[PDB]
Design an enzyme around this catalytic site. Structure first.
Site, PDB file in Angstrom:
ATOM      1  N   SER A  68       0.877  -1.165   0.000  1.00 13.38           N
ATOM      2  CA  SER A  68       0.000   0.000   0.000  1.00 13.38           C
ATOM      3  C   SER A  68       0.915   1.215   0.000  1.00 13.38           C
ATOM      4  O   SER A  68       2.137   1.069   0.023  1.00 13.38           O
ATOM      5  CB  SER A  68      -0.883   0.020   1.250  1.00 13.38           C
ATOM      6  OG  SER A  68      -0.145   0.438   2.386  1.00 13.38           O
ATOM      7  N   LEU A  82      -3.091   1.066   7.019  1.00 13.12           N
ATOM      8  CA  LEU A  82      -3.413   2.224   6.197  1.00 13.12           C
ATOM      9  C   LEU A  82      -2.839   2.285   4.791  1.00 13.12           C
ATOM     10  O   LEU A  82      -1.760   1.770   4.505  1.00 13.12           O
ATOM     11  CB  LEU A  82      -3.000   3.506   6.925  1.00 13.12           C
ATOM     12  CG  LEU A  82      -3.825   3.958   8.130  1.00 13.12           C
ATOM     13  CD1 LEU A  82      -3.171   5.185   8.752  1.00 13.12           C
ATOM     14  CD2 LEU A  82      -5.251   4.275   7.689  1.00 13.12           C
ATOM     15  N   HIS A  93       3.710  -4.843   2.866  1.00 10.67           N
ATOM     16  CA  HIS A  93       3.130  -5.369   4.106  1.00 10.67           C
ATOM     17  C   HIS A  93       3.439  -6.839   4.329  1.00 10.67           C
ATOM     18  O   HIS A  93       3.755  -7.263   5.446  1.00 10.67           O
ATOM     19  CB  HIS A  93       1.604  -5.202   4.112  1.00 10.67           C
ATOM     20  CG  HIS A  93       1.147  -3.797   4.344  1.00 10.67           C
ATOM     21  ND1 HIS A  93       1.243  -2.812   3.386  1.00 10.67           N
ATOM     22  CD2 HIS A  93       0.584  -3.215   5.428  1.00 10.67           C
ATOM     23  CE1 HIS A  93       0.756  -1.682   3.869  1.00 10.67           C
ATOM     24  NE2 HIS A  93       0.349  -1.900   5.106  1.00 10.67           N
ATOM     25  N   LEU A  95       5.239 -10.448   2.290  1.00 12.19           N
ATOM     26  CA  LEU A  95       5.961 -11.088   1.201  1.00 12.19           C
ATOM     27  C   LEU A  95       6.192 -12.536   1.615  1.00 12.19           C
ATOM     28  O   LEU A  95       6.752 -12.791   2.677  1.00 12.19           O
ATOM     29  CB  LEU A  95       7.299 -10.371   0.970  1.00 12.19           C
ATOM     30  CG  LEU A  95       8.352 -10.998   0.050  1.00 12.19           C
ATOM     31  CD1 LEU A  95       7.712 -11.554  -1.206  1.00 12.19           C
ATOM     32  CD2 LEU A  95       9.394  -9.943  -0.296  1.00 12.19           C
ATOM     33  N   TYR A 139      17.838  -8.244   1.526  1.00 11.26           N
ATOM     34  CA  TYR A 139      17.214  -7.092   0.894  1.00 11.26           C
ATOM     35  C   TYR A 139      18.214  -6.063   0.372  1.00 11.26           C
ATOM     36  O   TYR A 139      17.905  -5.313  -0.557  1.00 11.26           O
ATOM     37  CB  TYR A 139      16.198  -6.466   1.852  1.00 11.26           C
ATOM     38  CG  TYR A 139      15.027  -7.392   2.069  1.00 11.26           C
ATOM     39  CD1 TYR A 139      14.794  -7.988   3.309  1.00 11.26           C
ATOM     40  CD2 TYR A 139      14.197  -7.743   1.004  1.00 11.26           C
ATOM     41  CE1 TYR A 139      13.767  -8.921   3.476  1.00 11.26           C
ATOM     42  CE2 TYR A 139      13.174  -8.669   1.159  1.00 11.26           C
ATOM     43  CZ  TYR A 139      12.964  -9.257   2.391  1.00 11.26           C
ATOM     44  OH  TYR A 139      11.969 -10.198   2.520  1.00 11.26           O
TER      45      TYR A 139
HETATM   46  C1  LIG Z   1      11.763 -14.877   2.709  1.00 14.90           C
HETATM   47  C2  LIG Z   1      11.074 -15.670   1.579  1.00 14.90           C
HETATM   48  C3  LIG Z   1       9.903 -14.814   1.019  1.00 14.90           C
HETATM   49  C4  LIG Z   1      12.081 -15.931   0.419  1.00 14.90           C
HETATM   50  O1  LIG Z   1      11.579 -16.735  -0.698  1.00 14.90           O
HETATM   51  P1  LIG Z   1      12.503 -17.697  -1.475  1.00 14.90           P
HETATM   52  O2  LIG Z   1      11.968 -17.896  -2.900  1.00 14.90           O
HETATM   53  O3  LIG Z   1      12.597 -19.037  -0.759  1.00 14.90           O
HETATM   54  O4  LIG Z   1      13.899 -17.073  -1.519  1.00 14.90           O
HETATM   55  P2  LIG Z   1      15.060 -17.021  -2.519  1.00 14.90           P
HETATM   56  O5  LIG Z   1      14.812 -15.988  -3.634  1.00 14.90           O
HETATM   57  O6  LIG Z   1      15.227 -18.416  -3.117  1.00 14.90           O
HETATM   58  O7  LIG Z   1      16.330 -16.652  -1.716  1.00 14.90           O
HETATM   59  C5  LIG Z   1      16.334 -16.929  -0.319  1.00 14.90           C
HETATM   60  C6  LIG Z   1      17.256 -16.124   0.591  1.00 14.90           C
HETATM   61  O8  LIG Z   1      16.523 -15.639   1.767  1.00 14.90           O
HETATM   62  C7  LIG Z   1      17.143 -16.164   2.997  1.00 14.90           C
HETATM   63  N1  LIG Z   1      16.141 -16.636   4.047  1.00 14.90           N
HETATM   64  C8  LIG Z   1      14.839 -17.136   3.882  1.00 14.90           C
HETATM   65  N2  LIG Z   1      14.224 -17.462   5.015  1.00 14.90           N
HETATM   66  C9  LIG Z   1      15.147 -17.170   5.994  1.00 14.90           C
HETATM   67  C10 LIG Z   1      15.143 -17.283   7.478  1.00 14.90           C
HETATM   68  N3  LIG Z   1      14.096 -17.747   8.175  1.00 14.90           N
HETATM   69  N4  LIG Z   1      16.285 -16.885   8.202  1.00 14.90           N
HETATM   70  C11 LIG Z   1      17.388 -16.404   7.545  1.00 14.90           C
HETATM   71  N5  LIG Z   1      17.514 -16.253   6.181  1.00 14.90           N
HETATM   72  C12 LIG Z   1      16.342 -16.661   5.433  1.00 14.90           C
HETATM   73  C13 LIG Z   1      17.971 -17.375   2.515  1.00 14.90           C
HETATM   74  O9  LIG Z   1      19.033 -17.675   3.259  1.00 14.90           O
HETATM   75  C14 LIG Z   1      18.386 -17.031   1.062  1.00 14.90           C
HETATM   76  O10 LIG Z   1      19.698 -16.405   1.006  1.00 14.90           O
HETATM   77  P3  LIG Z   1      20.902 -17.164   0.379  1.00 14.90           P
HETATM   78  O11 LIG Z   1      20.661 -18.696   0.342  1.00 14.90           O
HETATM   79  O12 LIG Z   1      21.145 -16.636  -1.063  1.00 14.90           O
HETATM   80  O13 LIG Z   1      22.151 -16.836   1.229  1.00 14.90           O
HETATM   81  C15 LIG Z   1      10.608 -17.103   2.069  1.00 14.90           C
HETATM   82  O14 LIG Z   1      11.614 -17.749   2.911  1.00 14.90           O
HETATM   83  C16 LIG Z   1       9.280 -17.156   2.912  1.00 14.90           C
HETATM   84  O15 LIG Z   1       8.193 -17.265   2.323  1.00 14.90           O
HETATM   85  N6  LIG Z   1       9.355 -17.078   4.340  1.00 14.90           N
HETATM   86  C17 LIG Z   1       8.195 -17.123   5.191  1.00 14.90           C
HETATM   87  C18 LIG Z   1       7.470 -15.768   5.269  1.00 14.90           C
HETATM   88  C19 LIG Z   1       8.334 -14.610   5.734  1.00 14.90           C
HETATM   89  O16 LIG Z   1       9.009 -14.670   6.773  1.00 14.90           O
HETATM   90  N7  LIG Z   1       8.267 -13.475   4.864  1.00 14.90           N
HETATM   91  C20 LIG Z   1       8.991 -12.244   5.108  1.00 14.90           C
HETATM   92  C21 LIG Z   1       9.992 -11.797   4.482  1.00 14.90           C
HETATM   93  S1  LIG Z   1      10.929 -10.562   5.418  1.00 14.90           S
HETATM   94  C22 LIG Z   1      10.209  -8.911   5.254  1.00 14.90           C
HETATM   95  C23 LIG Z   1       9.590  -8.654   3.893  1.00 14.90           C
HETATM   96  C24 LIG Z   1       8.753  -7.386   3.907  1.00 14.90           C
HETATM   97  C25 LIG Z   1       7.251  -7.645   3.892  1.00 14.90           C
HETATM   98  C26 LIG Z   1       6.754  -8.549   5.022  1.00 14.90           C
HETATM   99  O17 LIG Z   1       6.451  -9.731   4.765  1.00 14.90           O
HETATM  100  N8  LIG Z   1       6.639  -7.995   6.252  1.00 14.90           N
HETATM  101  C27 LIG Z   1       6.119  -8.757   7.414  1.00 14.90           C
HETATM  102  C28 LIG Z   1       7.213  -8.981   8.503  1.00 14.90           C
HETATM  103  C29 LIG Z   1       6.794 -10.082   9.495  1.00 14.90           C
HETATM  104  C30 LIG Z   1       7.457 -11.257   9.759  1.00 14.90           C
HETATM  105  N9  LIG Z   1       6.772 -12.004  10.710  1.00 14.90           N
HETATM  106  C31 LIG Z   1       5.647 -11.330  11.088  1.00 14.90           C
HETATM  107  C32 LIG Z   1       4.628 -11.678  12.024  1.00 14.90           C
HETATM  108  C33 LIG Z   1       3.568 -10.768  12.204  1.00 14.90           C
HETATM  109  C34 LIG Z   1       3.509  -9.527  11.480  1.00 14.90           C
HETATM  110  C35 LIG Z   1       4.530  -9.182  10.545  1.00 14.90           C
HETATM  111  C36 LIG Z   1       5.623 -10.090  10.338  1.00 14.90           C
END
Ligand SMILES: CC(C)(COP(=O)(O)OP(=O)(O)OC[C@H]1O[C@@H](n2cnc3c(N)ncnc32)[C@H](O)[C@@H]1OP(=O)(O)O)[C@@H](O)C(=O)NCCC(=O)NCCSCCCCC(=O)NCCc1c[nH]c2ccccc12
Length: 166
Positions: A68, A82, A93, A95, A139
């Protein structure tokens, strides 16, 4: 006549259910909470669908970004629910990539397409998000710079805010 092998498109409220299902495993199973509940997903996909992007494989959602507009330098608690139409910042928000499709570049591919997608619109000058510390370097690969502790609080979780100039 068939389900496309791959399809990238902006999401619509009809996709809300599929999005939340992924969040259940992607976020809730990890922390017991997620960035957007069903109503919140529908909220943004109604007000600003153009700020969303989905990747479908054989007719099923496997990755998404829901955003957003924000109109302040830093993210705040109110920013979570918002959409500031007059803002110039694309606030990511949520991903996530389906558990069966991770570690194969889908997240990176989707993020890059998203940045170009939103950076093609006449008001988006910056992209902002918050993430766990361990993901800051990931990132940075996309132009994002760490911007200090995010003011947003979610349970016992804390985040680092990151900004990207578009
Ligand atoms: C992060 C991702 C989207 C990546 O997708 P994927 O296709 O597998 O990745 P890729 O392109 O192949 O590359 C993966 C890279 O990410 C790194 N990575 C993935 N998960 C990781 C983890 N748990 N710890 C450390 N590194 C990680 C991984 O090491 C790799 O790097 P390298 O192997 O090259 O060294 C996937 O692992 C996933 O779906 N994770 C579960 C959902 C998640 O945590 N999404 C957030 C992304 S971070 C921030 C993104 C901004 C938006 C957002 O989602 N904000 C919410 C913030 C929030 C988190 N928890 C909450 C709880 C309540 C409220 C809010 C939140």
């Amino acid at each position: 006549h068939t389900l496309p092998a791959n399809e990238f498109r902006c999401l619509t409220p009809e996709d809300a259910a599929g999005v939340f299902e992924i969040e259940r495993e992607a976020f809730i199973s990890v922390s017991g909470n997620c960035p957007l509940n069903l109503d919140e997903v529908q909220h943004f996909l109604t007000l600003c669908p153009e700020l969303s992007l989905g990747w479908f494989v054989e007719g099923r959602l496997v990755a998404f970004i829901i955003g957003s507009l924000w109109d302040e330098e830093r993210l705040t608690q109110e920013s979570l629910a918002l959409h500031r139409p007059r803002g110039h910042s694309a606030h990511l928000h949520a991903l996530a990539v389906h558990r069966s499709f991770r570690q194969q570049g889908k997240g990176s591919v989707l993020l890059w397409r998203y940045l170009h997608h939103v950076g093609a619109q006449p008001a988006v000058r910056r992209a902002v998000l918050m993430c766990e510390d361990a993901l800051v370097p990931f990132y940075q690969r996309f132009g994002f710079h760490p911007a200090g502790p995010c003011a947003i609080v979610v349970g016992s979780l804390t985040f680092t805010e990151m900004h990207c100039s578009l």
